[PDB]
Chains A and B, each alone.
With several copies, the nearest count.
Chain A
Amino acid sequence: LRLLDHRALVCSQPGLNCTVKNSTCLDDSWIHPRNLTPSSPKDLQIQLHFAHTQQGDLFPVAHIEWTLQTDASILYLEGAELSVLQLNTNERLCVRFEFLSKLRHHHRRWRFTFSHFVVDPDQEYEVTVHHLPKPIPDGDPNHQSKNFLVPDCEHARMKVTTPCMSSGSLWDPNITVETLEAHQLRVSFTLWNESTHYQILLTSFPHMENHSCFEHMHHIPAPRPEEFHQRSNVTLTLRNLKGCCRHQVQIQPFFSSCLNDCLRHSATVSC
């Protein structure tokens, strides 16, 4: 939750002059409330867009368009405060629209968009756009929330975004398990561009059962910059046992972003 650029932004439109002023989610209307308030927004809607920084990197940006309700209280509206709330971490991120010029008519629809909130990949957020001034104590709400859900790093266009490139779904390790000698297996897989260790976890189960006869872990030291992207090969001696035919080998990476929680890859052999 942050706005990709500190660049200035535009909320003006044919008929309206306003500017966007960073705002804590506190407003001079919440305290020192004005007498006559405006009506809620209507048609709040949130889509998924992706924007570049000035540097190469690109993030998933939340695109908030809402329109202005068509009634008399428009006269008295003087801005709208947006609030993005990440549910996990109780993090709120506000900006605020401010109209230099009031508007007295509803001749055609007053639509607003704002897509400069950067968003995390698997995250659910609750965007909510209050109208300004804010309701007097014990008055009508005049805002409009809408839950928003960002798809995991498997989204066709998502996975190609910076936060998913780091700890990236772009890293696939061609995983090769060769039966080899009896009581011996040789696993190969290609590795990432980060000098952080890995871990293979070979567990073998009785066929048709979820108990494990044999389980062996193998630490792999942090790759040197020269070794990046070059398959690594580990030969492990399996348990000399009958019925211990079914083998699951999974690989866990520890990339800086997501360290320890990274997704793992399980290949399984059956006899």
Chain B
Amino acid sequence: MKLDIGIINENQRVSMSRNIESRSTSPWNYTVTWDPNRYPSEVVQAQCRNLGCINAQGKEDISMNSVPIQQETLVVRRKHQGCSVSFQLEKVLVTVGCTCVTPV
């Protein structure tokens, strides 16, 4: 069970990212979670700023909710218990942002 240290991206974005964190009706902020034992160290996580979305007036519309959008990703976690160092894979759920939804 050997993992090649080599990695490559055919996925270079070549588009424009956008500062929609605060322009969203369901705004959120980012947090850089850091673990020296996993790769990559830094994984950015977002949390919803409010419980409800935000109207055009700026007031919080309680009637519709601010909710998290999650993404599955892999990180390699290294365990070192003992003299031996050994790392396995790990599915972690990064919260990417928030969207506005009608409750049911």
Interface of A toward B, CB cutoff 8 Å? 1-2, 24-26, 28, 30-33, 83, 85-92, 120-124, 126, 128, 135, 137-138, 141, 145, 152, 163, 167, 199, 201, 217, 252, 257-258, 260-261, 263-264
Which listed residue (B1, B5, B67, B71) contacts A89, Cβ 8 A?
Answer: B71
Q: For residue B39, which residues in chain A have a CB less than 8 angstroms away from its CB?
A: 25-26, 30
User: Given A83-B42, A128-B42, A138-B80, A24–B6 Cβ distance below 8 Å?
Assistant: yes
Q: For residue B94, which residues in chain A have a CB less than 8 angstroms away from its CB?
A: 90
Within 8 A of A (CB), among B1-46: 1, 5-7, 12-13, 15-19, 21, 30, 32, 36-37, 39-44
* CB proximity of A2 to chain B, nearest CB, Å: 6
* CB proximity of B62 to chain A, nearest CB, Å: 7
Q: B36 near A141 (CB under 8 angstroms)?
A: yes
Q: For residue A90, which residues in chain B have a CB less than 8 angstroms away from its CB?
A: 43-44, 71-73, 94, 96
Q: B78 near A86 (CB under 8 angstroms)?
A: no
Q: B104 near A24 (CB under 8 angstroms)?
A: no
Q: A135 near B36 (CB under 8 angstroms)?
A: yes
Measured in the bound complex, the distance between the Cα atoms of B103 and A258 in whole Å is 12
24 chain-A/chain-B pairs, Cβ below 8 angstroms: A1-B13, A26-B7, A31-B5, A31-B85, A33-B85, A83-B40, A85-B32, A86-B17, A89-B93, A90-B73, A91-B13, A92-B42, A122-B19, A124-B19, A126-B44, A137-B37, A145-B32, A145-B42, A252-B103, A257-B16, A261-B103, A263-B103, A263-B104, A264-B104
For chain B, the count of residues having a C-beta within 8 Å of the partner chain is 42
Q: For residue A32, which residues in chain B have a CB less than 8 angstroms away from its CB?
A: 85
Instruction: Annotate B48-73 by CB proximity to A: 1 below 8 A, 0 otherwise.
Output: 00010000000000110101011111
Q: For residue A258, which residues in chain B have a CB less than 8 angstroms away from its CB?
A: 16, 18
Residue of A nearest to B8 (CB): A24
Measured in the bound complex, the distance between the Cα atoms of B11 and A263 in whole Å is 27
User: Given A86-B17, A261-B67, A261-B101, A126–B42 Cβ distance below 8 Å?
Assistant: yes
User: Given A31-B85, A126-B32, A260-B65, A89–B17 Cβ distance below 8 Å?
Assistant: yes
Measured in the bound complex, the distance between the Cα atoms of B67 and A1 in whole Å is 20
Q: B19 near A152 (CB under 8 angstroms)?
A: yes
Q: B40 near A167 (CB under 8 angstroms)?
A: no
- The 10 tightest CB contacts between A and B, nearest first, are A137-B80, A122-B19, A91-B72, A87-B30, A24-B7, A263-B104, A87-B44, A88-B17, A89-B70, A120-B17
Residue of A nearest to B39 (CB): A26
User: Given A31-B78, A217-B62, A263-B103, A85–B16 Cβ distance below 8 Å?
Assistant: no
* CB proximity of B76 to chain A, nearest CB, Å: 8
Q: For residue A264, which residues in chain B have a CB less than 8 angstroms away from its CB?
A: 103-104
* CB proximity of A265 to chain B, nearest CB, Å: 10
